[PDB]
Design a binder for this molecule. Structure first.
Ligand SMILES: COc1ccccc1CC(=O)N1C[C@@H](C(N)=O)CC(F)(F)C1
Ligand SMILES: [Zn+2]
Length: 139
């Protein structure tokens, strides 16, 4: 579990979105596994606007943060799950690191702020849904 709170927005993995998220929907994209909903309280996360390929992520299955080198956002094949059939997920960045399904929502941060959230994993790899291109999160 986990979300990003920036201004009047809440960013979560689309497959983990709640009834409230869907009732206050701003935007959603199945191909990215992202959903943004509105909030009544004000958020203070800083979204990074950069091309960093190093950062730190939170891994709930280990109660620890880990430093990682990660790839540039791209289309990556993802196996079928209970939420999606087998497909290419876009705007995904991979890194070598531990992750389990419950780790989704954990934040990846670089020196500039929030980069994205855990969205996929398996076999010693962890994938993050990028949020740095969503310029509207700020205005
Ligand atoms: C962090 O996730 C994992 C880590 C280790 C092993 C397995 C996973 C799970 C995983 O990759 N998915 C894909 C994900 C998606 N974005 O399509 C949806 C899902 F969470 F239900 C299953
Ligand atoms: Zn950065």
């Amino acid at each position: 579990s986990g979300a990003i709170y920036v201004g009047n927005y809440r960013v979560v993995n689309r497959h983990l979105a709640t009834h409230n998220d869907w009732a206050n929907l701003v935007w959603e994209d199945s191909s990215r596994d992202l959903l943004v909903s509105s909030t009544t309280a004000q958020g203070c996360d800083t979204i990074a606007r950069c091309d960093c390929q190093t950062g730190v992520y939170y891994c709930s299955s280990r109660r620890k943060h880990y430093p990682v080198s990660f790839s540039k956002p791209s289309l990556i094949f993802v196996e079928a799950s209970e939420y999606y059939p087998a497909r290419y997920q876009s705007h995904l960045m991979l890194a070598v690191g531990h992750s389990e399904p419950g780790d989704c929502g954990g934040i990846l941060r670089c020196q500039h702020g929030v980069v994205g959230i855990v969205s996929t994993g398996g076999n010693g790899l962890v994938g993050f849904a990028d949020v740095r291109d969503l310029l509207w999160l700020d205005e």
